[PDB]
């Protein structure tokens, strides 16, 4: 047993390792979306940069779980990072729809970890999730939903002019 | 009943007074460690200053419980502050080991108070503990554990050169 | 065929995807080393930060291969990122020895890609490797070799005081 | 023989003169595109400025070949600069398609000169091409390809509103 460990259940330790992996998986998916939108035959570079920034965010969130594990006296255990589900992402609407689903998947895993922490009477882990993850997660889901609404309004997938305009106005100039 | 009191159980009020006392006790122990390391026949002044700073931190944490009590309409009730368990602290390793145990004792009392607050359905007291105590407590326990690991690596208790080097490199120059 | 593609062999395209994967693999290994050295029972935080910085460097080098692929009209194809070979890294000497081997493995893959680019008469890919990778790779290998020499001089693995001193003097304060 | 000449084949000297001419030819084509887009019955002035800037770039690249020739002890020999292939350029899509082809033609000539330099064992000329031309050439080809993709998305040639929007958003305000 680690000399620092106190009130830290083995199940929570394992679930934090699984969260770490899921954040890395999410980062890698967003990296794939970045590369797709930067293709010469896609060429929506502000959309590409949005996804690149989200990849970096998810990697930072993985790092925060590594540090959490060590602070509690758990032990980081890494697994393979699975490649993304698709190699090509269709268009801005399909990608944003996939991002919404990804963000909801990550949110459900966070919520499930909060349930576990609650069951194991671990208020430090509850706090960590509430303070560092849950709200920023709700904000991301909201933003992507707002984007999907606007992509539909702009006539995606058919309306290429609409897609062009989204890249100029909805996402920040890179 | 205080005019401000709302949703504040008598048991929680009493437990906050006991936490106040425990923080004062912890402060006083750290003060003893400070004085020991500043002795002419010990003379590890950066280690001494580390413990002096921790004494001041614990006193500030006691003050925060006094203010909490008043904000909720409870009543501060003070008890004697017991002298520390030892009059002399051996060496840097023994002191850090005693500090780890002290920090874990304080952590357990915080966690027990969170349990009580949860049982009495007091989310304000839960929040206060999560926001002001639990994380900083985990950080302190981690730091002291890291120090103990390094003191062992440096050959304590036998290796005086190792002890000298810890005071120069691991704790901030005072 | 991409409208931008010119003088870019399919074999080179595939080898760039494999390089991308290898850089991600190297990043992930360095992340594991970071987490290990930040454990409470290891606690060599400057060594940990050295490896964290190298993880970030390798991730940036992966990103540069993604961008290269798109610039040439190739297509990024991602594979799983394999977990590192070890879950725990022994001590600073064992980790640095593993890092040397990793850097040499990456170097050999770069050199092999340069051979391929040369065989396929692709001077743009040769230049990219020479200008962005080969020299920085030689510098990293040299630095890690210098470190191993110093860790041996300091008496690793047995000499814990030596290991402590390396973390204070050889790697930058984090 | 020039007193400075060393390791500089006559064939390479001649090919550098031909490259100089081709860069001047490319400059002149881009100037024609500039003038076309500035016509009162075309009036896409940001597109016009993009082509004017590229004309100036190609002229600068011609000048760099003149200086190279002199530095090696070769002798600049000028030929007529042929007028561009068209007197009118249709619309933004047709012009960008012609620019892509032009950039690929120049790239092929650069690559062919690198082959020649390699055959004549002239590493200075290889370096010059790799360091000053090949990468910037790949970037230009990529940019123009990205533009063509966006012009198609915007409904060119039929969609005049799309063409108007490209001039406002894709090319820098002049
Ligand atoms: Cl525990
Ligand atoms: Cl704890
Ligand atoms: Cl416990
Ligand atoms: Cl507990
Ligand atoms: Cl737990
Ligand atoms: Cl457990
Ligand atoms: Cl696990
Ligand atoms: Cl996992
Ligand atoms: Cl774009
Ligand atoms: Cl830490
Ligand atoms: Cl813990
Ligand atoms: Cl574990
Ligand atoms: Cl993992
Ligand atoms: Cl695995
Ligand atoms: Cl797996
Ligand atoms: Cl995964
Ligand atoms: Cl998907
Ligand atoms: Cl796919
Ligand atoms: Cl998903
Ligand atoms: Cl609970
Ligand atoms: Cl709890
Ligand atoms: Cl949050
Ligand atoms: Cl939401
Ligand atoms: Cl919006
Ligand atoms: Cl529409
Ligand atoms: Cl739709
Ligand atoms: Cl929007
Ligand atoms: Cl009450
Ligand atoms: Cl209240
Ligand atoms: Cl009440
Ligand atoms: Cl209530
Ligand atoms: Cl209460
Ligand atoms: Cl009560
Ligand atoms: Cl009381
Ligand atoms: Cl008391
Ligand atoms: Cl001292
Ligand atoms: Cl007050
Ligand atoms: Cl109250
Ligand atoms: Cl009271
Ligand atoms: Cl008291
Ligand atoms: Cl008393
Ligand atoms: Cl008493
Ligand atoms: Cl006491
Ligand atoms: Cl004691
Ligand atoms: Cl004593
Ligand atoms: Cl204690
Ligand atoms: Cl409750
Ligand atoms: Cl509650
Ligand atoms: Cl806290
Ligand atoms: Cl801790
Ligand atoms: Cl430390
Ligand atoms: Cl020793
Ligand atoms: Cl010992
Ligand atoms: Cl230390
Ligand atoms: Cl090709
Ligand atoms: Cl090319
Ligand atoms: Cl080709
Ligand atoms: Cl070729
Ligand atoms: Cl190639
Ligand atoms: Cl091919
Ligand atoms: Cl591939
Ligand atoms: Cl691969
Ligand atoms: Cl350290
Ligand atoms: Cl690009
Ligand atoms: Cl290419
Ligand atoms: Cl491919
Ligand atoms: Cl990959
Ligand atoms: Cl795979
Ligand atoms: Cl695989
Ligand atoms: Cl891998
Ligand atoms: Cl290994
Ligand atoms: Cl292992
Ligand atoms: Cl290796
Ligand atoms: Cl070659
Ligand atoms: Cl070549
Ligand atoms: Cl380099
Ligand atoms: Cl080297
Ligand atoms: Cl060195
Ligand atoms: Cl030794
Ligand atoms: Cl050895
Ligand atoms: Cl060194
Ligand atoms: Cl010569
Ligand atoms: Cl020469
Ligand atoms: Cl010669
Ligand atoms: Cl020669
Ligand atoms: Cl030559
Ligand atoms: Cl000759
Ligand atoms: Cl000539
Ligand atoms: Cl000519
Ligand atoms: Cl205009
Ligand atoms: Cl000159
Ligand atoms: Cl010469
Ligand atoms: Cl000549
Ligand atoms: Cl000419
Ligand atoms: Cl002529
Ligand atoms: Cl002629
Ligand atoms: Cl000409
Ligand atoms: Cl033409
Ligand atoms: Cl014409
Ligand atoms: Cl052409
Ligand atoms: Cl050669
Ligand atoms: Cl050569
Ligand atoms: Cl270049
Ligand atoms: Cl290109
Ligand atoms: Cl673009
Ligand atoms: Cl249209
Ligand atoms: Cl068309
Ligand atoms: Cl564009
Ligand atoms: Mg132990
Ligand atoms: Mg376990
Ligand atoms: Mg698979
Ligand atoms: Mg909270
Ligand atoms: Mg918050
Ligand atoms: Mg966020
Ligand atoms: Mg999130
Ligand atoms: Mg507009
Ligand atoms: Mg605007
Ligand atoms: Mg009253
Ligand atoms: Mg009472
Ligand atoms: Mg007594
Ligand atoms: Mg509850
Ligand atoms: Mg709660
Ligand atoms: Mg907090
Ligand atoms: Mg603290
Ligand atoms: Mg505390
Ligand atoms: Mg095509
Ligand atoms: Mg292929
Ligand atoms: Mg495996
Ligand atoms: Mg260089
Ligand atoms: Mg480097
Ligand atoms: Mg490298
Ligand atoms: Mg020293
Ligand atoms: Mg020093
Ligand atoms: Mg002469
Ligand atoms: Mg000649
Ligand atoms: Mg003619
Ligand atoms: Mg070079
Ligand atoms: Mg260059
Ligand atoms: Mg250029
Ligand atoms: Mg060029």
UniProtKB/Swiss-Prot annotation, chains A, B, C, D:
Keywords: Iron, Iron storage, Metal-binding, Oxidoreductase. PROSITE patterns: FERRITIN_1 (PS00540), FERRITIN_2 (PS00204), FERRITIN_LIKE (PS50905). Fe cation 2 binds at residues 58, 103, 137, 140. InterPro entries: Ferritin, Ferritin-like, Ferritin-like_diiron, Ferritin-like_SF, Ferritin_CS, Ferritin_DPS_dom. One of its GO terms (cellular component) is cytoplasm. The keyword Metal-binding applies. It holds the Pfam family Ferritin. Transmembrane segments: none annotated. Its EC number is 1.16.3.1. One of its GO terms (molecular function) is ferric iron binding. It catalyses: 4 Fe(2+) + O2 + 4 H(+) = 4 Fe(3+) + 2 H2O. Fe cation 1 binds at residues 23, 58, 61. One of its GO terms (biological process) is intracellular iron ion homeostasis. It is an enzyme of class 1 (oxidoreductase). Gene3D superfamilies: 1.20.1260.10. Coiled coil: none annotated. Residues 6-155 form the Ferritin-like diiron domain. There are three types of ferritin subunits in amphibia: L, M and H chains. M and H chains are fast mineralizing; the L chain is very slow mineralizing. Belongs to the ferritin family. Oligomer of 24 subunits. The functional molecule is roughly spherical and contains a central cavity into which the polymeric mineral iron core is deposited. Stores iron in a soluble, non-toxic, readily available form. Important for iron homeostasis. Has ferroxidase activity. Iron is taken up in the ferrous form and deposited as ferric hydroxides after oxidation. This is Ferritin, middle subunit. It comes from Aquarana catesbeiana.
């Amino acid at each position: 047993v680690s000399q620092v460990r106190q009130n830290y259940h083995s199940d929570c330790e394992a679930a934090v390792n699984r969260m770490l992996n899921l954040e890395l998986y999410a980062s890698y998916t967003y990296s794939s979306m970045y590369a797709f939108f930067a293709r010469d035959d896609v060429a929506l570079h502000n959309v590409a940069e949005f996804f690149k920034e989200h990849s970096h965010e998810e990697r930072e969130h993985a790092e925060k779980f590594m540090k959490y594990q060590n602070k509690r006296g758990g032990r980081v255990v890494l697994q393979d990072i699975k490649k993304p589900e698709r190699d090509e992402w269709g268009n801005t609407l399909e990608a944003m729809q996939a991002a919404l689903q990804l963000e909801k998947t990550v949110n459900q895993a966070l919520l499930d970890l909060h349930k576990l922490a609650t069951d194991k009477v671990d208020p430090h882990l509850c706090d960590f999730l509430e303070s560092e993850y849950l709200e920023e997660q709700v904000k991301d889901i909201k933003r992507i939903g707002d984007f999907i609404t606007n992509l539909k309004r702009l006539g995606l997938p058919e309306n290429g002019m609409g897609e062009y305009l989204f890249d100029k106005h909805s996402v920040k100039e890179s």
